[PDB]
Amino acid sequence: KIEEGKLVIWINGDKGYNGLAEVGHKFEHDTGIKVTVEHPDKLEEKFPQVAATGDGPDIIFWAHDRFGGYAQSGLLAEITPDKAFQDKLYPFTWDAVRYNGKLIAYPIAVEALSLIYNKDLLPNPPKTWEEIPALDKELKAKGKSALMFNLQEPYFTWPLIAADGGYAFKYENGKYDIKDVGVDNAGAKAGLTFLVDLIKNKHMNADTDYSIAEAAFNKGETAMTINGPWAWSNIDTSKVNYGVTVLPTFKGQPSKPFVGVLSAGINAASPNKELAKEFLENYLLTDEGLEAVNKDKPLGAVALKSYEEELAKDPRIAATMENAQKGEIMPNIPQMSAFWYAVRTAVINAASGRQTVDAALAAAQTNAAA
Ligand SMILES: OC[C@H]1O[C@H](O[C@H]2[C@H](O)[C@@H](O)[C@@H](O)O[C@@H]2CO)[C@H](O)[C@@H](O)[C@@H]1O
Ligand SMILES: [Ca+2]
Ligand SMILES: [Cl-]
């Protein structure tokens, strides 16, 4: 059961959870209510596990794509923001947290992947994926590599898979057809094949994960990485001279990252819904609230109009939105979890050589479909 008279908040370990706790700290001073912020591993799977029993955090933070599944399972309270507060956030951010005609979470920030590059190693970053193999060769002469990013999470490879025609669920008639999956079409296969060939030709390592890729880029060992605004902070610290720019094209086509809207839902079983509404609307979703979290780890382009007008100036935000525009806002339908699981297994198996690309994506096609 969930404890009354306090706030428990879950947010992913890559985000500014210390900044968020700082906002909770102020809340505690003003109200006497303790706010405990936690970042459980794989919380996107852990939340529905514990919330299914009326347990868990009062507030859950994650990209909007998971929230449809959460609402369908009856895990999320409907949020009741008045028209005034609604007018404070961008309309399209409200759209991402609308399920079955109901708002099921507070939109916080728009996230998209960008190409992050070392200006000292790479004054002009590559415009195409195709030129990366040769680039890596040059850098291998300095004992360095061209590009490292997390291969354990399909989120990071998806931009390349969707570039030439890969897609999740066919969107027709304003609705998604959940039996029409596009993870094994010619476009998907060519994208994954190119990744697998990078590994096969020693330009990348199939074991590369988030931590390895981050360490490598921040220590100057690799010229490029692929990541979101949250990662900019640790790069700032390491004082590597970096830039953020458009993802490389593939086969002449833009990489198409799946765009997420970090959102805050309220546990349906929480006895602290009023507390949570207060905290979210009048502490977090203010200039000073978002600033506090942003200082810890950049959120991207925030949904709060007032604040995002300062942030849109930053050229890193501009690159994020350019990439967001070339990609697509994730669906929030409940089948998204099966999709992500399917594509994760496929990417990993093909990367490690455990399966051919065709066999990996054929299985993923079956698993993603209902
Ligand atoms: O890799 C599958 C994964 O992709 C997305 O997760 C992102 C998340 O949106 C970002 O905030 C980032 O910080 O972490 C994840 C990448 O590791 C989907 O949102 C998620 O549901 C899905 O499992
Ligand atoms: Ca678009
Ligand atoms: Cl990882």
Swiss-Prot record:
Its main location: periplasm. Belongs to the bacterial solute-binding protein 1 family. The keyword Transport applies. One of its GO terms (biological process) is cell chemotaxis. The complex is composed of two ATP-binding proteins (MalK), two transmembrane proteins (MalG and MalF) and a solute-binding protein (MalE). It holds the Pfam family SBP_bac_1. Gene3D superfamilies: Periplasmic binding protein-like II (3.40.190.10). Part of the ABC transporter complex MalEFGK involved in maltose/maltodextrin import. Binds maltose and higher maltodextrins such as maltotriose. SUPFAM superfamilies: Periplasmic binding protein-like II (SSF53850). Keywords: Periplasm, Signal, Sugar transport, Transport. GO terms for molecular function: carbohydrate transmembrane transporter activity; maltose binding. NCBIfam families: PRK09474.1 (NF007011). Induction: Induced by maltose and the transcriptional regulator MalT. Permanently repressed by cold shock in a PNPase-dependent fashion. It comes from the Bacteria. PANTHER family: MALTOSE-BINDING PERIPLASMIC PROTEIN, MALTOSE_MALTODEXTRIN-BINDING PERIPLASMIC PROTEIN. This is Maltose/maltodextrin-binding periplasmic protein. It is found in: Periplasm. One of its GO terms (cellular component) is periplasmic space.
